[PDB]
Amino acid sequence: LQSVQVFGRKKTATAVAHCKRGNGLIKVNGRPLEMIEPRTLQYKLLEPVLLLGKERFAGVDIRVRVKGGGHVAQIYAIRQSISKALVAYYQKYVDEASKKEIKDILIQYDRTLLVADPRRCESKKFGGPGARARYQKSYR
Template structure:
């Protein structure tokens, strides 16, 4: 039985995906994708699956995400799913399709939130200085 493992990161979220032969079921943190809430997250995660089309009909996808927020996890999961499906199929056409649709389906976004500094409200903002 063929099993493919893939992982991805987004901000502080980490995602792992296992793809194996099955009936086309998709589980995100143990929850079926069809009933995953909120809908924005569900649609974001479904993008690589919808683009792959019939390739996904005979595989099961199990995704787990840890850390970060809900959208960071969704982005990490979608990248990991796209990578896993690509490795499973080995299709060069699918790779071109993913890259043309959205480069972040295969390439991670390395940006991270800058840490807060002392004497300020956020990473860059400081208290205004008054001379009068």
């Protein structure tokens, strides 16, 4: 069999996508890709498909399992974990030029799709309520 499973993550939302050989199946936690909430962020999950075309997703089945984070973090985790899975599938089996043809499209559009943003929550300090904010000081 020809399968691969990569990850792609936002803050604490880790998403792993299993990429077998199959027929055009993209679903997340058992649910179809078009029915993932929030539906305001519908096109951010479809930026893998709308850029490259469905025909580059034709020979595979994609099954994304997602854990952690929040609603908006998990949308950016899925679209990264899809876009890194098709690159690993067109590398371990298909030619390096076929990888480079879609590596060029996914860097021209939204570098976040392949390189994870390293920003995490800066810790809270005892001066104030947040990381940087301080409690209000009074003189007289």
